Amino acid sequence: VRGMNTSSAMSAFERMEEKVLMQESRAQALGELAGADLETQFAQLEGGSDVD
Amino acid sequence: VRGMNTSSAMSAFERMEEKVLMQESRAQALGELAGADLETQFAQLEGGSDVD
Amino acid sequence: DELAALKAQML
Amino acid sequence: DELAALKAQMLP
Amino acid sequence: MGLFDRIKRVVSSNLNDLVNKAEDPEKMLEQAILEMQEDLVQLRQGVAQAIAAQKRSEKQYNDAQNEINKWQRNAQLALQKGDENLARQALERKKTYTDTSAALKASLDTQSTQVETLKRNLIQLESKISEAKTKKEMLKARITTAKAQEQLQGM
Amino acid sequence: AQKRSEKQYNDAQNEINKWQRNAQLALQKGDENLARQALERKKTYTDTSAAL
Amino acid sequence: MGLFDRIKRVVSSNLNDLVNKAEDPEKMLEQAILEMQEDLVQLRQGVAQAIA
Amino acid sequence: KASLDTQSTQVETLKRNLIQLESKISEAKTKKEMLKARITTAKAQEQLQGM
């Protein structure tokens, strides 16, 4: 509960920081892919497609 | 998607450039063959032949 | 919780 | 200027 | 400064020699094809485990639901018994289980989304290999044509 | 090499048509960013084409 | 950079060499035939055991 | 928020810079093909001139 240096507690804290950063990094990598025009065009295309 | 230096990605990029150049070179070689009068005459002959 | 218990008591 | 042209294109 | 210049010249010469020597479309493609499939298999195994985990989670969720039902019967039994404490315990347990179920449901939704994302990614990945396979066949076909073309040019 | 450049040039022309269509679609969509990207893309391609 | 470039060439050559050595229609079929037959016998035995 | 705002501006600038950098490499890549073609032609031309 304290979240103190408890070894199990400590490992969880270390792991939580890493996954969030990795997820953010993964999202950032996805964003870079998203940045390209073909990907951007698909999003516009997708909305029209969804209605159809 | 990035097409980055990814080894599979890189090989494909290397391969794509080579085939296009080879195909162009092959076409150029064909063009040289095409340049000769007998080959040129056949094209004129072919149009008449196709109608027949 | 006490209110819920009263309903349970009926049965 | 290009953006302004794009906006004009968007309205119809 | 001189050493850096010398290193660059050596590297440039080595690089030029290296690209020409290793530029085989068929060898690279075959290696690439094997690697993507292997990578896909690992992803598939993870996906299968995730699907199994979701099923396991559902079983755990089902057990909680089953426990609540069993507890409900106990509450009826408690009324016959006439003991206030048994009834109170069941109600408290029922409430935490519902809260736990809600948390589990949220986790399940996240898991489902992750699986869906993985599945979507897998489909895209699967499409790429199919395209590559089609491309490889086309590339191979072109190579055969080139061999035929050279002989024709020669004669 | 000339054929390859022409193919690349043709691809750029093809890309321009596709990008232009996307920009029109973007306007209908109402997303300003998608439209903006198309305009930037159009300018570089024309410059590249002229140089090519 | 040079080391990375060397690895791709080496890996492709090694992969190509390995598949080529084992690329025999009769040998591959024979190896495949032995494995399924062994599996079939095991499966048949297992089925018999399961029935028992 | 103050740190994020400053950070956001830096990232946006980097992103803008990255796009320019990406554009620059693409332009350079295009130049090699053009450079390769003239060089090959130049090589071909000297042999003919010598003959």
Numbering used by the authors:
A (entry chain T), B (entry chain M): 156 to 207
C (entry chain BA): 208 to 218
D (entry chain S): 208 to 219
E (entry chain F): 1 to 155
F (entry chain ND): 53 to 104
G (entry chain G): 1 to 52
H (entry chain E): 105 to 155
Sentences from the paper on this structure:
This homology is evident in cryo-electron microscopy structures of Vipp1 rings from the cyanobacterium Nostoc punctiforme presented over a range of symmetries. Rings have an inner lumen that is able to bind and deform membranes.
Reconstructions were also generated for the other six symmetries and complete ring models built. Rungs are maximally constricted at the top and bottom with internal lumen diameters of 14 nm and 15.7 nm, and widest at the ring equator between rungs 3 and 4 with an internal diameter of 17.5 nm. The analysis of different ring symmetries, ranging from C11–C17, provides us with a view of the structural flexibility that enables Vipp1, PspA, and ESCRT-III family members to perform their functions. Furthermore, as each ring comprises between 5–7 rungs stacked together to build a dome-shaped architecture, these asymmetric structures provide us with a glimpse of the structural features that enable filament tilt in the context of an ESCRT-III-like polymer. Consistent with this, Interfaces 1 and 3 linking the top two rungs were poorly resolved in Vipp1C11–C17 rings, indicating a weak interaction once the limiting geometry is reached.
